[PDB]
Structure 1
């Protein structure tokens, strides 16, 4: 009768779709609640400075 392209025929999927994605490369910045400085400044007086 005639030739037919593959895309011309609907295809049913025999594969189970298992979607696994990698974990995003995540960069941890230096985060400090109080720096050694803030902490040194937290003192009401510094004997050294005084």
Structure 2
């Protein structure tokens, strides 16, 4: 009696590798926050009047 792995084996199937799409996490990103846009002005009427 001999084991099943003692004889050479050939794959009769046509392998098809399937790599699922990895999960992705999106982080917040802004070129200019609303605070930066407000600060872009040279003068602010609110602060000047205050």
Q: The TM-score by the shorter chain falls in which range?
A: 0.7 to 0.9
Q: What 5-or-longer segments of structure 2 have no aligned partner? A: none
**Higher helix share goes to which structure?**
2
> TM-score, structure 2 length as denominator?
0.83
> TM-score, structure 1 length as denominator?
0.83
Q: What 5-or-longer segments of structure 1 have no aligned partner? A: none
Tell me, in whole angstroms, the C-alpha distance in 2 between the residues paired with 1:17 and 1:47: 71
**Runs of 4+ displaced beyond 3 Å:** none
CA-based RMSD of the aligned residues comes to 0.9
- Cα distance per residue 1:22-50 (max 9 Å; x no partner): 11110000011111111111111111111
